[PDB]
Amino acid sequence: MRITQGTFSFLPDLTDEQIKKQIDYMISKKLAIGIEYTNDIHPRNSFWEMWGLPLFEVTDPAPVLFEINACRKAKSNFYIKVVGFSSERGIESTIISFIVNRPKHEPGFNLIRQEDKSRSIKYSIQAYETYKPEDQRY
């Protein structure tokens, strides 16, 4: 399956040309830019791993693309996303987050149903790769 977290995940995976134009937009919006990666693709895994520190005051997409590519080489079989943080008062949060690398095959999620009172169920979702240690996924 195809995991559809991310702003453009219903599109084909972005080319580097496409990514570069998204960095331009981020820059024009004055965002801090973070590159983050993970191999527990659970939708409530809020804290992916950080690839270095966010880049602030970026003025050219080049350094950003370089780190993205450095991350892809070191972590080719992890999901990797780019995140743009706005520091505008009242927002002070993420305003864009999209996937720039996927592992080659995504097996998806186990759905667990624990039967509770009457007819209610307590659900968990667990990504299949996380039944394996980190250094063995994907």
């Binding site: 399956m1 219903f10 599109l11 331009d24 693709i41 809020s46 927002i91 864009i96």
Partner: protein, 448 residues
Amino acid sequence: PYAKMGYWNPDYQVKDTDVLALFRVTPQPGVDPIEAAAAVAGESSTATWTVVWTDLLTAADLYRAKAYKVDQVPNNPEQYFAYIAYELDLFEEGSIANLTASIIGNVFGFKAVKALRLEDMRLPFAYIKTFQGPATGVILERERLDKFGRPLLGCTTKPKLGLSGKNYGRVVYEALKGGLDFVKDDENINSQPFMRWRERYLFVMEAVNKAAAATGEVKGHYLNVTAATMEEMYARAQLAKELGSVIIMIDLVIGYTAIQTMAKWARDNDMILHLHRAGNSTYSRQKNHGMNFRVICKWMRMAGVDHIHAGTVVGKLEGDPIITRGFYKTLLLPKLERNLQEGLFFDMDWASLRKVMPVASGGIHAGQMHQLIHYLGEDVVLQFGGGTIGHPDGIQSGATANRVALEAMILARNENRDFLTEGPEILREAAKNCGALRTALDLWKDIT
């Protein structure tokens, strides 16, 4: 004799703490504009028809509303804009019912005016600060969903009524798994002989968790908790929370005290609260009488709902684009600037209350994505209808077509393409890679 009784004061100096109302006034054929204005101030404040000595046991002037400016409206000689000021002390802190009573109480039935419409209000900072504002708000909502930089997508279950709890859940599952972020209960589905509420909730949560597991996203369904009494609403709300729903919905017709009750509940229970505006058009539609919808948007942001239907510019409600923009501003900005074309008559600071997510629905389709993005912007929930469920290829296909169009349009916008001009082509390029979307475009090109 209102203008002589103290209710007209063109000299009055407005204070930062004053509540100010802007009424669109249509005087009776003979009556003077200033007299009309003063009458509306008087009739909604200290409006007694003889002299009373008991007034003198109080600081009487404080409790008098003051009509302090009248202008004839731009294109209609028979209408005036009347500006009225009310002392902050007249109102109960945090109470919409008190604000409402106090402002719109008597004056709509008064005879010396033919017609009367409340158009805008300036809520002062110190009053706004006594309200909770949105239980969740746009920013936290997106952090909860982990969905950023794009509108969210939803649709209402079709048929609105009649499906069994199990057949109902089927539609939810298909729509969410196909790409929609949300599905919802119709404002009319509460608990009825063809389907009671509990089995709906229970089937729905299985649908919702199945779709999370299928897509890897947080998904939700607005469970409608609308009920006749507050205890019954609490029971429904409690089940949605117990089953782990991310979101519930309420109909505006439960009225303002129940809405503030639920808004507190949602804040304390980590629940997104969608307000369905069912019934609002009975007083917000005619241009000469009633209340403008922007004043409802103000009151509901204060009360603390997280989403509210705010208008589509195109479709079954092709309303004014500039007026709609005004609604979205009220809902979403930290500060409002007066702009007569938008219908915002006062500057207004929102005192860091959270933002409400506007919702567009009503005969919209993927073929309009470029106007939708252009008019409504990025923080909005686009709600499809027969747009999704009646795709010839199935519900999942209906959902996917919408999601692909949305994302392709945002991608284009961020590339700085002229998406409004180039939009139909941008759609066509996306449809090249997406059959479901090609089928949707073909199917809804001549939509009249």
